[PDB]
Amino acid sequence: FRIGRSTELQNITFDMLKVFEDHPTSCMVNHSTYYVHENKNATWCLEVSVTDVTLLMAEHDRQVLNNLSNCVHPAVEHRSRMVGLLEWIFRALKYDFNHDPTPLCQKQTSTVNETRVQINITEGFGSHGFEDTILQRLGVLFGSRIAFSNGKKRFLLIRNSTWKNQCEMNHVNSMHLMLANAGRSSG
Amino acid sequence: FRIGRSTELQNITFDMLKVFEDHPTSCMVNHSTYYVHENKNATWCLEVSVTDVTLLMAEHDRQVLNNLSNCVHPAVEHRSRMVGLLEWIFRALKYDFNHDPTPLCQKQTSTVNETRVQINITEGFGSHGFEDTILQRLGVLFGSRIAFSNGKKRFLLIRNSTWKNQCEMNHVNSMHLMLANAGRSSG
Amino acid sequence: FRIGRSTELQNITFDMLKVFEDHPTSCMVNHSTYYVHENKNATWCLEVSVTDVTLLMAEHDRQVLNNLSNCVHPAVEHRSRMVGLLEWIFRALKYDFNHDPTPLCQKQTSTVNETRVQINITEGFGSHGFEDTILQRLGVLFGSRIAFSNGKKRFLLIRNSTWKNQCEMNHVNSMHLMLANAGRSSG
Amino acid sequence: GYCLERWMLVTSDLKCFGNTALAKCNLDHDSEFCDMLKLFEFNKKAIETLLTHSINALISDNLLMKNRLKELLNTPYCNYTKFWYVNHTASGEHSLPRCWLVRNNSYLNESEFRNDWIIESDHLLSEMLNKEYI
Amino acid sequence: GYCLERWMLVTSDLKCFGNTALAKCNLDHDSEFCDMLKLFEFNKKAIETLLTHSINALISDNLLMKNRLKELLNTPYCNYTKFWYVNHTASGEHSLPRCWLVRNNSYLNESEFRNDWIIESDHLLSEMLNKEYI
Amino acid sequence: GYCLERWMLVTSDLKCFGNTALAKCNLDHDSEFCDMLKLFEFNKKAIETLLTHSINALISDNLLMKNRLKELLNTPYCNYTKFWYVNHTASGEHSLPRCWLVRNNSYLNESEFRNDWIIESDHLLSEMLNKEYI
Ligand SMILES: *[C@@H]1O[C@H](CO)[C@@H](O[C@@H]2O[C@H](CO)[C@@H](O[C@@H]3O[C@H](CO[C@H]4O[C@H](CO)[C@@H](O)[C@H](O)[C@@H]4O)[C@@H](O)[C@H](O[C@H]4O[C@H](CO)[C@@H](O)[C@H](O)[C@@H]4O)[C@@H]3O)[C@H](O)[C@H]2NC(C)=O)[C@H](O)[C@H]1NC(C)=O
Ligand SMILES: *[C@@H]1O[C@H](CO)[C@@H](O[C@@H]2O[C@H](CO)[C@@H](O[C@@H]3O[C@H](CO[C@H]4O[C@H](CO)[C@@H](O)[C@H](O)[C@@H]4O)[C@@H](O)[C@H](O[C@H]4O[C@H](CO)[C@@H](O)[C@H](O)[C@@H]4O)[C@@H]3O)[C@H](O)[C@H]2NC(C)=O)[C@H](O)[C@H]1NC(C)=O
Ligand SMILES: *[C@@H]1O[C@H](CO)[C@@H](O[C@@H]2O[C@H](CO)[C@@H](O[C@@H]3O[C@H](CO[C@H]4O[C@H](CO)[C@@H](O)[C@H](O)[C@@H]4O)[C@@H](O)[C@H](O[C@H]4O[C@H](CO)[C@@H](O)[C@H](O)[C@@H]4O)[C@@H]3O)[C@H](O)[C@H]2NC(C)=O)[C@H](O)[C@H]1NC(C)=O
Ligand SMILES: *[C@@H]1O[C@H](CO)[C@@H](O[C@@H]2O[C@H](CO)[C@@H](O[C@@H]3O[C@H](CO[C@H]4O[C@H](CO)[C@@H](O)[C@H](O)[C@@H]4O)[C@@H](O)[C@H](O[C@H]4O[C@H](CO)[C@@H](O)[C@H](O)[C@@H]4O)[C@@H]3O)[C@H](O)[C@H]2NC(C)=O)[C@H](O)[C@H]1NC(C)=O
Ligand SMILES: *[C@@H]1O[C@H](CO)[C@@H](O[C@@H]2O[C@H](CO)[C@@H](O[C@@H]3O[C@H](CO[C@H]4O[C@H](CO)[C@@H](O)[C@H](O)[C@@H]4O)[C@@H](O)[C@H](O[C@H]4O[C@H](CO)[C@@H](O)[C@H](O)[C@@H]4O)[C@@H]3O)[C@H](O)[C@H]2NC(C)=O)[C@H](O)[C@H]1NC(C)=O
Ligand SMILES: *[C@@H]1O[C@H](CO)[C@@H](O[C@@H]2O[C@H](CO)[C@@H](O[C@@H]3O[C@H](CO[C@H]4O[C@H](CO)[C@@H](O)[C@H](O)[C@@H]4O)[C@@H](O)[C@H](O[C@H]4O[C@H](CO)[C@@H](O)[C@H](O)[C@@H]4O)[C@@H]3O)[C@H](O)[C@H]2NC(C)=O)[C@H](O)[C@H]1NC(C)=O
Ligand SMILES: *[C@@H]1O[C@H](CO)[C@@H](O[C@@H]2O[C@H](CO)[C@@H](O[C@@H]3O[C@H](CO[C@H]4O[C@H](CO)[C@@H](O)[C@H](O)[C@@H]4O)[C@@H](O)[C@H](O[C@H]4O[C@H](CO)[C@@H](O)[C@H](O)[C@@H]4O)[C@@H]3O)[C@H](O)[C@H]2NC(C)=O)[C@H](O)[C@H]1NC(C)=O
Ligand SMILES: *[C@@H]1O[C@H](CO)[C@@H](O[C@@H]2O[C@H](CO)[C@@H](O[C@@H]3O[C@H](CO[C@H]4O[C@H](CO)[C@@H](O)[C@H](O)[C@@H]4O)[C@@H](O)[C@H](O[C@H]4O[C@H](CO)[C@@H](O)[C@H](O)[C@@H]4O)[C@@H]3O)[C@H](O)[C@H]2NC(C)=O)[C@H](O)[C@H]1NC(C)=O
Ligand SMILES: *[C@@H]1O[C@H](CO)[C@@H](O[C@@H]2O[C@H](CO)[C@@H](O[C@@H]3O[C@H](CO)[C@@H](O)[C@H](O)[C@@H]3O)[C@H](O)[C@H]2NC(C)=O)[C@H](O)[C@H]1NC(C)=O
Ligand SMILES: *[C@@H]1O[C@H](CO)[C@@H](O[C@@H]2O[C@H](CO)[C@@H](O[C@@H]3O[C@H](CO)[C@@H](O)[C@H](O)[C@@H]3O)[C@H](O)[C@H]2NC(C)=O)[C@H](O)[C@H]1NC(C)=O
Ligand SMILES: *[C@@H]1O[C@H](CO)[C@@H](O[C@@H]2O[C@H](CO)[C@@H](O[C@@H]3O[C@H](CO)[C@@H](O)[C@H](O)[C@@H]3O)[C@H](O)[C@H]2NC(C)=O)[C@H](O)[C@H]1NC(C)=O
Ligand SMILES: *[C@@H]1O[C@H](CO)[C@@H](O[C@@H]2O[C@H](CO)[C@@H](O)[C@H](O)[C@H]2NC(C)=O)[C@H](O)[C@H]1NC(C)=O
Ligand SMILES: [K+]
C-alpha cells in the first residue's frame, strides 16, 4: 500500500493456534450459548448457556456446597480434568461461593448423561446487583453483548457435552480465561 | 502567552455540565458533609455526613439486613429512585453488606420526615482497619482530606433532604460515582 | 562507557537506606524463611516460614477469631507494635479472616517464650485454590519462587524472634509491604 | 480537523484541532484531554441516536484515581477543566492539549510548569522541520 | 533482527524485524504486538526446554480488558490477529507494528485509520533523516 | 537543574540532572527512576516539616508488580537500585535515566541491552540537532 513515494503500508497476520492449542479456550455461538474447551485433543466440552427455563429444582436436586466434584460422575475418565475446567469457569466468572447464590447440580440418579450446574441469576434470588455483575462478566469472558441487551427468570447453566466443533477457536477468549485462572492447573 | 518568536501558549476551558447534567453527581460542603444529587431536575438530595453524634439506637431503630428499600417510606413518589441512589452511594463506598457493620435506619413510626442510614465506623464496632478504608473511600469519592486529618466514636449518616443548592456541581465527583457504579441504573 | 564519539553511557546507584530506615521492611533468607522488620532500631523481628511440620494443635491451642491481639503476651513492652506488624503481614497476604482457614496461635500458658501463629494452607483444609493464592502472595511479597517450585501438609508459621541481622534489608520488599498497607500505622 | 461545539467550551468560540495532534490520542498513552473528547463524542452520538455502560471505556480509571490521590496530598493534579496546548500561530499546527494542573484550589501559574510547555514547544517545532525536509 | 518462524504467521513467508523497532517494545509502553511476541518467545523457550504461571507477565491485562470493552461497545478494538507497520522499502527500516483495528467483525479499512499510518510514516522518515545527520 | 544529595547516592558525588530530562517524568509515562525521585522529594519535604499515606501516589503499583513478576520468572527486571542514562559529555545534556535491569542476581552487561542505550543515544543527538535548527 502506497503511503508515500518511499513508504509502504504493510501488515502481518498472526497464527496463534499452536501457542494456544493445549490450553483452555472459549467460544461464542450466540449471545447466550458458549463452549469451553480445554484443548484440541479433548472430546468433551462445557456448554455455558443463559436460559430462561429451569432445569434443576431445589427439592429434587443436589446443591453445590464445597462438593462440586461430586456433581461429575466417578465413572468418566476425565472427571478430575472436567472438575478442573469447571473451577476455571467459576473462577473466571469471579464467583464467590460463600455469598453468591448456591449453584444446583443434577441428582446422582438422573437418567440423563450430562452433568448440569444451574445458577439462579434472577434479581430476586440473588443479592442486589448480582445479575448485572454476572452478565457483565459473561460479556467480558465470552465477548457477548447480553448485558447491553434488555418478571422473567434467568439462569446460568453449565452442562457437559461431546465436542462436535460447535465453535471456531478464539485465542482472545483463551487469554481471558487464562488471565482469570493464573498460576493454576486443572484439578 | 508568548512562549517564543513563533510559538504561543494557549488554553481551552471545558464546560461539561451538559454531558453530566442527567447523571448522578456529588459535591463537598466541608470535609464532613457531602451532597449526592441524581440530576439537576431532582428536588431531593442525599446528605452523607461524618458525625460524632449518634442519631439511631439499635434497640429502638431498624437494621439494614437485605431490606434497604424498606428504609424509605412508600408514600414518596421517588422511593425507587432514592433507593437506587442509596445503592449507588453504598456501592461507591465499596461496602460489603455481608461482613461490614450493620447499618441502622430510622423507625417506621418516626415523626421526623427523613430517612436516616447510620453506619458505625468506630474502630471498636467494626473489624480492624474498616474505619481507615471507609475514610479513605470518602476522600476518594468526595475529595475530602478527612482520612489525613487526625477515643471518640464516628458515624456515617446518609439522610435525605430537599435540594437547596448547597454546593456547586463537580463533574469529577460525577466521574468517580459513575466509575464505582458501572453498567447499572437507579433501582 | 563509550557509546560513541560524543556519547557516553553513565549510571547512578541509589542508596535508599535513609528513606526506608524507619518503615517496615522484609527480606528473604531462603524460599521458605522470611524476616519482617519494623525498622532498624527494632530489636524484634517476625519470622514467616513455610513449614511441613505442625507446631500448634487445635485441641490444645488458641484460635484467632477477632482476637489476634491476645496472641501476644501483655508483658512485652512492644505488644501493640508487634500486633501492628502482624496485621501488616496479614493484610499484605490479602488474608480474609472471615472465610480463610482460621489461624491458630500458641496457648497462653506455653512455656516457650515465642508467639506462634499457624495457618493451615494445605489444599484439604482450605477452600480450593487457597494454597495457590497464598503461595503466589508469598512470592509477590518476599520475592520467593515457592509457588513455581513443586500428600504433604503445608503450614505458614509467623513466630516472633530477636533481630539478629539474619538478612540484608531490601527496599523493594519495603515498597511491597507499604503498598499492601496504605494509610495505616502500627497498632 | 475535529471542531469542538459552542456548548462544549465556556469561551463559545469555535476551536478546531488538527488531525495529527488528535491522532496522538489513539496511541497507547492514556490522557485527560482525550478522555474528555471521548465523553463529548459519546454524548454527541447519544444525542443523535447509556453513559453508565460506556464509562469504563470512555474514562481511564487509573488516571482519574492518581489525579485525585495527587489532589488529596496537596500536590498539583488534573481536575479536568482547563487544558493547555502549544499552538504555532503562523502555520496553525498545535500540540495535543495537556491538563492545566491545579494546586490549592488555584490553577498553576505558567512559570510553575514552564519546562512542560518549553520542551513541548520544542518538540512541535522539531516535527515541523522534519515536514519541510521530508 | 528478530525473524518470525513460518508457523507463527499465516503467510508462511519469513518476516525479520529490525532491532530498533523491536527495541521500542522494551519501553514503558504496553503494546499488543509486543505481548504477542512475548508469547511466541515463551512458547519457543518452552519447546526448547508453564504458560499459566507466566501469563500475567507475558500479557497486559489492562490492555486486553480495554480492547474487549471496546469490542462490546461496537467501537474499533484490537483482536490480536493482524498488525500493520510502516516499512520504508528502499532502506528496509520499519515502524513498530500496531494492531489493525477491527469493528463489526471486519478489519478497518486503511482510510479509516489513515492518520495513524500517516504520522507513523512521517516519524519514521524523520528518524532516518537524523541518522544521516548523526 | 535537580541536584541529588550526597546521601541519596552510594557514590557520594554531586549529580545534577538537567530540567528537560526531569521534565520527561511529568509525562503520562510511569517510570522507576521518576518514582524514586518522588520518594526522595517526599523525604526531603518530610525532613523540612506520612509515607504510608503518600505511598500510592509516589510509587506506581502496577510497574512494581510487573517488575516483581519478571523477577519471579527469571526474566530481567528492575530492582530499583541502579539506573543508566545517556550523557552527551561535551554539552552535558543527558537522557532520562532508565533502570539497569538485573537477571539472576547480577546486573545485565552493557551489551545485553545494547539496543536500549543505542536508540536513546540516537534520540538524544536528534533532539540536540533540532535545538541548533530551532
Ligand atoms: C453437597 O453437600 C450438601 C450438604 O448440604 C448436600 O446437600 C444435602 O444432601 C442430603 C443428601 O445427601 C440431603 O439431606 C436431606 O435432608 C432432609 C432433611 O433435612 C432438612 O433440613 C435441611 C437443613 O438442615 C434442609 O435442607 C432440608 O430441606 C430439610 O428441611 C431429609 O428429608 C432427606 O432424607 C432423604 O434421604 C434419606 C437418605 O439419606 C432418605 O431416608 C429419606 O427418605 C429422604 O429421601 C435428606 O437427608 C439434602 O439435600 C442436603 N442437606 C443439607 C443439610 O444441605 C448435597 O447433596 C451435596 N451435593 C453434592 C453435589 O455433592
Ligand atoms: C458428562 O458427564 C456425565 C455424568 O453425568 C457422563 O455420563 C456418565 O458416563 C458414565 C461413563 O463414564 C456412565 O457410567 C456408566 O453407566 C453404565 C450404565 O449405567 C447403568 O449402571 C447400572 C447398570 O446396572 C445401573 O445403575 C443402571 O442400569 C445404569 O443405567 C454402566 O454400565 C457403566 O459401568 C461400566 O463402567 C464402570 C466403571 O468402570 C464399571 O464398574 C462397570 O463394571 C462397567 O464396566 C458406567 O457406570 C454414567 O451412567 C453416565 N451418567 C449418568 C448420569 O448415568 C458423560 O459421559 C459426560 N460426557 C462427556 C462428553 O464428558
Ligand atoms: C430488616 O429485616 C430485619 C430482620 O432481622 C428486621 O429486624 C427485625 O425487625 C423486627 C420488626 O420488624 C424486630 O423483631 C423483634 O424481635 C424481638 C426479639 O428479637 C431479639 O433478638 C434479635 C436477635 O435474633 C435481636 O436483633 C433483637 O434486638 C432482640 O434482642 C422481639 O422482642 C420484638 O417484639 C416487639 O414487637 C412485637 C410486635 O412485632 C411486640 O409484640 C413485642 O412486644 C415487641 O414490641 C420484635 O419482634 C427486630 O427489630 C428485628 N428482629 C430480628 C430477629 O432481627 C429489620 O427491622 C428490617 N429492617 C428494615 C429497614 O426493613
Ligand atoms: C425523605 O424521606 C421521608 C421518608 O422517611 C419523606 O417523608 C415522607 O413524605 C411522605 C410524602 O409522600 C409522607 O407521606 C404522607 O404523610 C402524611 C402524614 O402522615 C400521617 O399519616 C397518618 C395520617 O393520620 C398517620 O400515621 C400520621 O398522622 C402521619 O403523620 C399523609 O397525609 C399522606 O397521606 C396522603 O397520601 C397518601 C398516598 O398518596 C394517601 O394514601 C393518603 O390518603 C393521603 O392523601 C402521606 O402518607 C410521609 O409521612 C413522610 N414521612 C414521615 C416519616 O413522616 C420525605 O418527603 C423525603 N424527602 C425528600 C426530599 O424526598
Ligand atoms: C479467641 O476467642 C475464641 C472464641 O472462639 C477463643 O476460643 C475459645 O477458647 C475457650 C477458652 O478461652 C475455649 O472454650 C472451651 O470450650 C469447651 C467446650 O466447647 C465446646 O464447643 C465449642 C464450640 O461451641 C468447641 O469449639 C469446643 O471444642 C467444644 O466442643 C470446654 O471444654 C473448655 O473448657 C476448658 O476450660 C475451662 C475453663 O474455662 C475448664 O474448666 C475446663 O476444664 C476446660 O479446660 C473451654 O471452655 C475454646 O478453645 C474456644 N471456644 C470457642 C467456642 O471457640 C480463643 O481462645 C481466643 N483466642 C485468643 C488468641 O484470644
Ligand atoms: C515474643 O513474644 C513472647 C510472648 O509470647 C515474649 O516472651 C515473653 O516475654 C515477657 C517479657 O515481658 C515475659 O513476661 C515476663 O515473664 C517472667 C516469667 O514469667 C513467669 O511468670 C510467673 C512468675 O511466677 C509464672 O506464671 C511463671 O513462672 C512464668 O514463667 C516474669 O518474671 C515477668 O514478670 C515481671 O514483669 C512484670 C511486668 O513488668 C511484673 O508484673 C512482674 O512483677 C515481674 O517484674 C514477666 O511477666 C513472658 O513470660 C514471655 N512469654 C512467655 C510465654 O514466657 C518474647 O519476649 C517476644 N520476643 C521478642 C523478641 O519480642
Ligand atoms: C479478528 O477479527 C477478524 C475479522 O476481521 C477475524 O478474521 C476473520 O476470521 C474468520 C473466522 O472467524 C474468517 O472466516 C473464515 O474464512 C475461511 C476462508 O474461507 C473463506 O475465504 C474467503 C473469505 O475470507 C471467501 O472468499 C471464501 O469463499 C471463504 O468463505 C473459511 O474457511 C471459514 O469458514 C468457517 O466458518 C464458516 C462459518 O459459516 C463455516 O461454514 C465453515 O465450514 C468454516 O468452519 C470462515 O469463513 C475470516 O475470513 C476472517 N476475516 C478476514 C478479513 O480475514 C479474526 O479471526 C479475528 N481474530 C480473533 C482472534 O478474534
Ligand atoms: C539489585 O540487584 C543487585 C544485584 O545485581 C544488588 O546489588 C548487589 O547487592 C549485594 C547485597 O545483597 C552486594 O553484595 C554485597 O557486597 C558488599 C561489598 O563487599 C564485596 O565487594 C566486592 C563484590 O561487590 C568483592 O570484591 C568484595 O570481596 C566483597 O565481597 C559486601 O559488604 C556484602 O557482604 C554482605 O553479605 C555477605 C553475604 O555472604 C556477608 O558474608 C557479609 O558479612 C555481608 O553481610 C555483600 O556481598 C553486591 O555487591 C551488589 N552487586 C553489585 C553488582 O553491586 C542490589 O542490592 C539489588 N537491590 C535491591 C534493592 O534489591
Ligand atoms: C430463581 O429465583 C427466582 C427469583 O427469586 C425465583 O422466582 C421466585 O419464586 C418465588 C417462589 O419460590 C416467588 O414467590 C411467590 O410470589 C408469588 C407472587 O408472584 C406469591 O403469590 C407466592 O406466595 C410466592 O411468594 C417469586 O415471585 C418468584 N420471583 C420471580 C421473579 O419469578 C425462582 O423460584 C428461583 N428458581 C430456582 C430454581 O431456585
Ligand atoms: C458504635 O461502636 C462503638 C464502638 O464499638 C460503640 O461504643 C461502645 O459502646 C459500648 C456499649 O454498648 C461500650 O461498652 C461499655 O464500655 C464501658 C467502658 O467505657 C463499660 O463501662 C461497659 O461495661 C461496657 O463495656 C464500649 O466501650 C463502646 N466502645 C467505644 C470504643 O467507645 C457504640 O455504642 C456504637 N454505636 C451504636 C449506635 O451502636
Ligand atoms: C491441616 O489440614 C490438613 C488437610 O486438611 C489436615 O490433615 C488432615 O487430617 C485429618 C485428621 O483430622 C485426616 O483425616 C483422617 O484421614 C485418614 C486418611 O489418611 C483417615 O484414616 C481418618 O479417618 C481421617 O479421615 C485428613 O486425611 C488429613 N488430610 C490430609 C490432606 O492429609 C491437618 O490435620 C490440618 N492441620 C491442623 C493443625 O489442623
Ligand atoms: C557505573 O559507573 C561507575 C562510575 O560511576 C563505573 O565504575 C567505574 O569503572 C571504571 C572502569 O572500570 C573505573 O575506572 C572507575 O574507578 C569506577 N568508578 C567507581 C566509582 O567505582 C561502573 O563501571 C558502572 N557500573 C556498571 C557498569 O555496572
Ligand atoms: K465473605
| DSSP assignment string, E28-89 | S---SHHHHHHHHHHHHHHHH--HHHHHHHHS-HHHHHHHHHHHHTT--B--SSEEEEEEET
Task: Name the A residues in 85-104 with CB < 8 Å from any B CB.
Answer: 98-99
Bridge partners, D120 (sequence order): none
For C115, residues 6+ apart whose C-beta sits below 8 A from its C-beta are C71, C72, C73, C82, C105, C106, C159, C160
Cα of E20 from ligand 1 centre, angstroms: 67
By Cβ distance, the residue of E22, E53, E134 closest to F125 is: E134
Rounded to whole angstroms, the Cα distance separating B68 from B80 reads 11
Cα Rg of chain B (Å, integer): 19
* Angle C103-C105-C110 from CA coordinates, rounded to 5°: 165
CB A169 within 8 A of CB A17: yes
Query: Is B40 touching A (CB cutoff 8 A)?
Result: no
CB F55 within 8 A of CB F80: no
User: Which ligand lies nearest the alpha carbon of A14?
Assistant: 7
For F7, residues 6+ apart whose C-beta sits below 8 A from its C-beta are C15, C18
Are chains D and C in contact at 3+ CB pairs closer than 8 Å?
no
Answer whether residue B105 is part of any domain.
yes
Answer whether residue B1 is part of any domain.
no
- DSSP class of residue B45 equals E
CB D101 within 8 A of CB D77: yes
Rounded to whole angstroms, the Cα distance separating F101 from F75 reads 9
Chains with 3 or more CB pairs closer than 8 angstroms to F?
A: C, D, E
User: Given the C-alpha cell 431445589, which residue does it identify?
Assistant: A58
Residue D82's SS3 state is strand
Bridge partners, C45 (sequence order): C37, C161
Answer whether residue B57 is part of any domain.
yes
Q: Give the long-range contacts of residues B61-64, CB within 8 A, separation 24 or more.
A: B61/B104, B61/B105, B61/B106, B61/B107, B61/B118, B62/B104, B62/B105, B62/B106, B62/B107, B62/B108, B63/B102, B63/B103, B63/B104, B63/B105, B64/B97, B64/B102, B64/B103, B64/B104, B64/B105, B64/B117
Rounded to whole angstroms, the Cα distance separating C19 from F40 reads 7
Which residue of C98, C99, C128 is the best one to mutate when testing the A interface, meaning the one whose CB has the most A CBs within 10 A? C128
Give domain limits for chain F: 2-133
CA-proximal residue: ligand 8, atom 55 (nearest): F81
CB D77 within 8 A of CB D107: no
Are E122 and D133 a contacting pair at CB < 8 A?
A: no
Rounded to whole angstroms, the Cα distance separating C42 from C20 reads 14
Measured between beta carbons, the chain C residues lying within 8 angstroms of A66 are: 127
Rounded to whole angstroms, the Cα distance separating D80 from B13 reads 9
Rounded to whole angstroms, the Cα distance separating C68 from B35 reads 38
For A14, residues 6+ apart whose C-beta sits below 8 A from its C-beta are E8, E9, E10, E36, E80, E81, E82, E83
Residue F87's SS3 state is strand
Residue B7's SS3 state is strand
Please, is A65 exposed, middle or buried when counting C-beta atoms within 10 Å of its C-beta (0-12, 13-18, 19+)? exposed
Q: Cα dihedral sign for E45, E50, E56, E60? A: positive
- DSSP class of residue F107 equals B
CB C159 within 8 A of CB C8: no
Count of other CB atoms within 10 angstroms of residue D108: 16
* Angle F113-F115-F119 from CA coordinates, rounded to 5°: 130
Cα separations (Å) of D60 from D54, E63, F101?
11, 11, 29
For C56, residues 6+ apart whose C-beta sits below 8 A from its C-beta are C104, C105, C106, C116, C118
Q: Cα dihedral sign for C2, C4, C7, C10? A: negative
For D81, residues 6+ apart whose C-beta sits below 8 A from its C-beta are B13, B14, B16, D100, D102
Rounded to whole angstroms, the Cα distance separating A45 from C65 reads 43
Please list the alpha-helical segments (H only) found in chain B.
17-20, 79-92, 130-142, 171-180
Q: Do you know the residue count of chain F? A: 134
Please give the residue of chain D at the shortest CA–CA distance from E126.
D130
Answer whether residue C4 is part of any domain.
no
Cα of A91 from ligand 11 centre, angstroms: 26
Are F117 and C16 a contacting pair at CB < 8 A?
A: no
Rounded to whole angstroms, the Cα distance separating C179 from F53 reads 10
CB C172 within 8 A of CB F72: no
Residue C61's SS3 state is coil
Q: Give the long-range contacts of residues C169-172, CB within 8 A, separation 24 or more.
A: C169/C17, C169/C20, C169/C25, C169/C27, C169/C37, C169/C40, C170/C25, C170/C26, C170/C27, C170/C28, C170/C143, C171/C16, C171/C17, C171/C19, C171/C20, C171/C25, C171/F80, C172/C143, C172/F64, C172/F68, C172/F79, C172/F80
Answer whether residue B109 is part of any domain.
yes
User: What is the number of structural domains in chain A?
Assistant: 1
Measured between beta carbons, the chain E residues lying within 8 angstroms of D133 are: 126, 129
For F4, residues 6+ apart whose C-beta sits below 8 A from its C-beta are C12, F14, F15, F16, F17, F40
CB C152 within 8 A of CB C52: yes
Range(s) of the domain holding residue C103: 21-180
**How far is Cα of residue B117 from the mean position of the Cα atoms in its chain?**
11
Secondary structure element (H or E) that encloses residue D85, with its range: strand D82-88
Answer whether residue A5 is part of any domain.
no
For C166, residues 6+ apart whose C-beta sits below 8 A from its C-beta are C27, C29, C35, C45
Experimental method of this PDB entry: cryo-EM
Of C15, B9, B33, B150, nearest to D121 (Cα)? B9
Pocket of ligand 7 contains residue A172 by CB under 6 Å: yes
CB D63 within 8 A of CB D35: yes
Chain E nearest CA to F37, separation (Å): 17
Cα Rg of chain F (Å, integer): 16
Chain B nearest CA to C64, separation (Å): 13
Answer whether residue C64 is part of any domain.
yes
For D18, residues 6+ apart whose C-beta sits below 8 A from its C-beta are D1, D92, D93, D94
| DSSP assignment string, C66-124 | S-GGGGS-TTSTTHHHHHHHHHHHHHHTT--TTTSPPPEE--TT-SS-S-EEEEE--TT
By Cβ distance, the residue of C91, C98, C183 closest to B136 is: C183
Are A14 and E80 a contacting pair at CB < 8 A?
A: yes
First to last CA, chain E: 22
Bridge partners, E132 (sequence order): none
Rounded to whole angstroms, the Cα distance separating E104 from E75 reads 8
CB C4 within 8 A of CB C143: no
Measured between beta carbons, the chain A residues lying within 8 angstroms of E100 are: 11
Rounded to whole angstroms, the Cα distance separating C86 from C187 reads 9
Cα separations (Å) of D48 from D41, D42, D45?
11, 10, 5
Rounded to whole angstroms, the Cα distance separating B3 from D33 reads 21
Beta strand A116-120 with A104-105 is antiparallel
Of B113, B114, B132, B112, nearest to B122 (Cα)? B132
Measured between beta carbons, the chain D residues lying within 8 angstroms of B144 are: 72
Cα of E60 from ligand 7 centre, angstroms: 27
Answer whether residue A114 is part of any domain.
yes
Rounded to whole angstroms, the Cα distance separating C167 from C154 reads 24
Pocket of ligand 6 contains residue C73 by CB under 6 Å: yes
Cα of A151 from ligand 9 centre, angstroms: 10
**How far is Cα of residue A76 from the mean position of the Cα atoms in its chain?**
20
User: Which ligand lies nearest the alpha carbon of B112?
Assistant: 4
| DSSP assignment string, chain A | -BSSSSEEEEEEEB--HHHHTTS-EE--SSSSEEEEES-TT-SEEEEEEEESS----TTTSEE-SS-GGGGS-TTSTTHHHHHHHHHHHHHHTT--TTTSPPPEE--TT-SSSS-EEEEE--TTTSPTTHHHHHHHHHHHHH---TTT------EEEEEEEE----S--BHHHHHHHHHHS-S----
Beta strand C116-120 with C104-105 is antiparallel
Please, is B53 exposed, middle or buried when counting C-beta atoms within 10 Å of its C-beta (0-12, 13-18, 19+)? exposed
Are D121 and B19 a contacting pair at CB < 8 A?
A: no
Longest Cα separation, chain B: 76
The data reach a resolution, in angstroms, of 2.9
CB C117 within 8 A of CB C186: no
Residue E107's SS3 state is strand
Residue C178's SS3 state is helix
Rounded to whole angstroms, the Cα distance separating A180 from A90 reads 10
Secondary structure element (H or E) that encloses residue D22, with its range: helix D19-23
CA-proximal residue: ligand 9, atom 13 (nearest): A124
By Cβ distance, the residue of F31, F75, F129 closest to E133 is: F129
Please, is E124 exposed, middle or buried when counting C-beta atoms within 10 Å of its C-beta (0-12, 13-18, 19+)? buried
Of E1, E69, E49, E9, nearest to E33 (Cα)? E9
User: Given the C-alpha cell 434497640, which residue does it identify?
Assistant: B59
Rounded to whole angstroms, the Cα distance separating A178 from C35 reads 33
Beta strand C7-13 with B155-162 is unpaired
User: Given the C-alpha cell 475514610, which residue does it identify?
Assistant: B135
Give the three cell numbers for residue C103: 489461624
